[PDB]
Write an enzyme that holds these catalytic residues in place. Structure first.
Site, mmCIF file in Angstrom:
data_model
loop_
_atom_site.group_PDB
_atom_site.id
_atom_site.type_symbol
_atom_site.label_atom_id
_atom_site.label_comp_id
_atom_site.label_asym_id
_atom_site.label_seq_id
_atom_site.Cartn_x
_atom_site.Cartn_y
_atom_site.Cartn_z
ATOM 1 N N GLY A 199 0.747 -1.242 0.000
ATOM 2 C CA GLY A 199 0.000 0.000 0.000
ATOM 3 C C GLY A 199 0.779 1.296 0.000
ATOM 4 N N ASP A 246 11.415 8.125 13.698
ATOM 5 C CA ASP A 246 10.064 7.605 13.551
ATOM 6 C C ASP A 246 9.866 6.363 14.405
ATOM 7 O OD1 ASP A 246 7.467 7.477 12.791
ATOM 8 O OD2 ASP A 246 7.878 6.490 10.836
#
Ligand SMILES: */C=C\C(=O)Nc1cccc(Nc2nc(Nc3ccc(N4CCN(C)CC4)cc3)nc3ccc(F)cc23)c1
Length: 299
Positions: free
Chosen positions: A26, A138
């Site tokens: 995705g 992150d």
């Protein structure tokens, strides 16, 4: 000046391995479960295969640059890259997916020992990334993978150097500043995520409004299972003064201390008799010749 990075970049042949199924897709790119069989080694190694503008290939060869330059038990192992039309990264397969899903799906079977020992294992992950003067930028529950329930590793160095607003420090949000101490903050959100069993942080507040809510002194609440000892440690990660925040080195020490009496610092209903899959279970695990990447060293 500084120290030469003598890491090695293994180039693999698209024939030396085979894809088994897809795990997910995705983002103009996909992840397969596969197997990698070094020519002539009589081993089969389970992998994850991550996979054409000209920008795209440069951005992924940079991820790979970095994974290539790490070895830690709590940092995803990069095996090599394959130079098909599409550049693809061969990584040690992490069978239980990512921790964020893991804790939502198995919510009611996770014991305080498991929580506290994941907490330790990431402090080590990141204490190591600091040893290597590396800033993750992150760190979140989504970006920690589960090899076994007893063993997790940090991944997604798509942002690592030397946007996810609800995870990042003040100075990050406001002055694009990132440090190992910006990373300690996200370690604190990440831990809140585990303690709340995959709750969404600031669930309701658009990231536009986040920065000011922090500027007021408001923070993320105390997970119900959380004694003040743990919640206090979450909080110190969220000081504005970043030198007051704790050091991954000290985070290792403090969770490791709690993981000796886990029931004293996390309070879970029927925490007592909570089992999770295990490598000494017959189920867990053709399959002939199969070795873990973590046991397959230099050829
Ligand atoms: C929490 C965030 C998230 O969803 N991460 C994620 C989803 C899919 C694929 C990957 N990349 C990846 N995955 C795995 N192992 C994996 C993925 C999915 C699943 N589920 C289990 C059950 N059904 C069948 C659906 C699929 C299980 C296991 N391992 C790795 C290892 C290394 C790496 F770089 C990426 C990776 C992440």
């Amino acid at each position: 000046g500084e120290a030469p990075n003598q890491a090695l970049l293994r180039i693999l042949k698209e024939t030396e391995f085979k894809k088994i199924k897809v795990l997910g897709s995705g983002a103009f790119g996909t992840v397969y479960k596969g197997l990698w069989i070094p020519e002539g080694e009589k081993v089969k190694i389970p992998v994850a295969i991550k996979e054409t503008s000209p920008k795209a290939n440069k951005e992924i060869l940079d991820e790979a640059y970095v994974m290539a330059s790490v070895d830690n038990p709590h940092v995803c192992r990069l095996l090599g890259i394959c130079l098909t039309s599409t550049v693809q990264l061969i990584m040690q397969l992490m069978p239980f997916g990512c921790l964020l899903d893991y804790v939502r799906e198995h919510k009611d079977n996770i014991g305080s020992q498991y929580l506290l020992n994941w907490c330790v294992q990431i402090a080590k992950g990141m204490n190591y990334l600091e040893d290597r003067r590396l800033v993750h930028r992150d760190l979140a529950a989504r970006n920690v993978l589960v090899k076994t329930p007893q063993h997790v590793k940090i991944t997604d160095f798509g942002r690592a150097k030397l946007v996810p607003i609800k995870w990042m420090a003040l100075e990050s949000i406001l002055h694009r500043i990132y440090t190992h101490q910006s990373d300690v903050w996200s370690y604190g959100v990440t831990v809140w995520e585990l303690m709340t069993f995959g709750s969404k942080p600031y669930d309701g507040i658009p990231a536009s409004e986040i920065s000011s809510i922090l500027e007021k002194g408001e923070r993320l609440p105390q997970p119900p299972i959380c004694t003040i000892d743990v919640y206090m440690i979450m909080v110190k990660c969220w000081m504005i003064d970043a030198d007051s925040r704790p050091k991954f080195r000290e985070l290792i020490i403090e969770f490791s201390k709690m993981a000796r009496d886990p029931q004293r610092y996390l309070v879970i209903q029927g925490d007592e008799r909570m089992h999770l899959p295990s490598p000494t279970d017959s189920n867990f695990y053709d399959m002939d010749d199969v070795v873990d990447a973590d046991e397959y060293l230099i050829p």
